[PDB]
């Protein structure tokens, strides 16, 4: 039958979703019609951190001609609140074989965000996609309000059929987890911690961000009691963790220490519309060869799970979401070159298959 890729049957077609593949997803885009503003398509231009005083770097206005990306979405200046966009995104996840949507989460305590989360869970479930949360560095984030928010999310969403579980446990990615000391993390994540989630209804796999050298990160991960670690950055060499020649040794350490390594792979990086001074971090896509090289390194490292940066971080040029050629009176956007708009979706499906072929 139609749309039976993920029906719960015995298919061996090489088209199934992979539930150890986590794709970072952003629900912060708006349209004037649905959200009141072209949210995130309009974006502040960041000042140069080395550029000194008197910078009025200005804004990108989020007009049709001028959006806060070096690329241009096939779906245009879409609203993340539009259920018809969300359906299309879930079909794209099915095409890419990415079984887990890792949703940015900013503690907005806003009804419009609660609506989005529920729409995303419902749309994902229709396609047998799962959702987990990517806990961002919201103001005054600390282990106590993280616990309260983990309790809220598991209580609100834990019965939803799309809520992700691995061996019965939810999973969270914690962005910039280094902004919190190991001694604070211990309270939440050690079985002995004063506010532990271990052995509670709110227990979860907690995946911290490995940034710098092993001498710093190994004791950080152990002393913080994270269950595993990810690397996030799509730009190779931005950090030690995002340098793929380190992934074999990072995996060896993870396996020795009972930790889950979820390296992050991406198809390229460019953020110079919003960060004009950040050109050193550009990584060119070269018609897919960059994505291929990074995905191959992750698979060769022997990991059990892979994360993809990103579905739709359009500001950072890491998206696998379809992009189209566009030249406006105001900017000539980058595009997928000699590849079709859906190439990064179907190339993701290819790599998911190689990952599964190798997988434990």
From TrEMBL:
The keyword Membrane applies. CDD domains: GH99. It is a single-pass type II membrane protein. Keywords: Golgi apparatus, Hydrolase, Membrane, Signal-anchor, Transmembrane, Transmembrane helix. Its main location: Golgi. GO terms for molecular function: alpha-mannosidase activity. The keyword Ligase does not apply. Transmembrane segments: none annotated. PANTHER family: ENDO-ALPHA-1,2-MANNOSIDASE, RE57134P. This is Glycosyl hydrolase family 71. It is found in: Golgi apparatus membrane.
């Amino acid at each position: 039958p139609s749309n039976s890729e993920n029906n719960g049957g015995n298919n061996n077609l090489g088209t199934e979703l992979d539930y150890d593949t986590f794709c970072f997803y952003y629900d912060w885009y708006g349209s004037e019609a649905i959200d009141g503003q072209y949210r995130h398509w309009a974006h502040a231009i960041a000042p140069d951190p080395n550029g000194g005083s008197g910078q009025n770097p200005g804004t990108i206005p989020g007009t049709q001609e001028s959006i806060a990306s070096n690329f241009y979405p096939q779906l245009g200046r879409y609203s993340s609140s539009d259920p018809n966009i969300l359906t299309k995104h879930m079909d794209m996840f099915v095409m890419a074989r990415t079984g887990v949507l890792a949703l940015t989460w900013w503690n907005e305590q806003d009804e419009t965000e609660a609506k989005r989360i529920g729409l995303i869970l419902d749309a994902a479930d229709k396609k047998k996609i799962k959702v987990c949360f990517h806990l961002e560095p919201y103001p005054s984030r600390n282990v106590q309000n993280l616990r309260e928010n983990i309790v809220k999310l598991i209580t609100r969403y834990g019965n939803h059929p799309a809520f992700y579980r691995k061996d019965g446990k939810p999973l969270f990615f914690i962005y910039d987890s280094y902004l919190i000391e190991p001694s604070e993390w211990e309270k939440l994540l050690s079985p002995g911690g004063s506010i532990t989630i271990r052995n509670t209804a709110y227990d979860a796999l907690m995946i911290g961000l490995w940034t710098s050298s092993p001498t710093v990160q190994r004791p950080f991960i152990l002393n913080a009691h994270f269950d595993g670690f990810y690397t996030y950055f799509a730009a190779t060499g931005f950090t030690y963790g995002s340098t793929p020649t380190n992934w074999v040794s990072m995996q060896k350490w993870a396996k020795e220490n009972g930790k889950i390594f979820i390296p992050s792979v991406g198809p390229g990086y460019i953020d110079t519309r919003i960060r004009p001074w950040n050109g050193s971090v550009i990584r060119t896509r070269t018609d897919g060869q960059y994505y291929d090289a990074m995905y191959r390194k992750a698979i060769e490292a022997g990991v059990s799970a892979i994360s993809i940066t990103s579905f739709n971080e359009w500001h950072e040029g890491s998206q696998i979401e379809p992009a189209v050629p566009y030249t406006s009176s105001e900017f000539t956007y980058l595009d997928y070159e000699n590849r079709e708009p859906d190439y990064y979706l179907t190339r993701t499906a290819y790599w998911v298959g190689k990952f599964r072929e190798s997988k434990q």
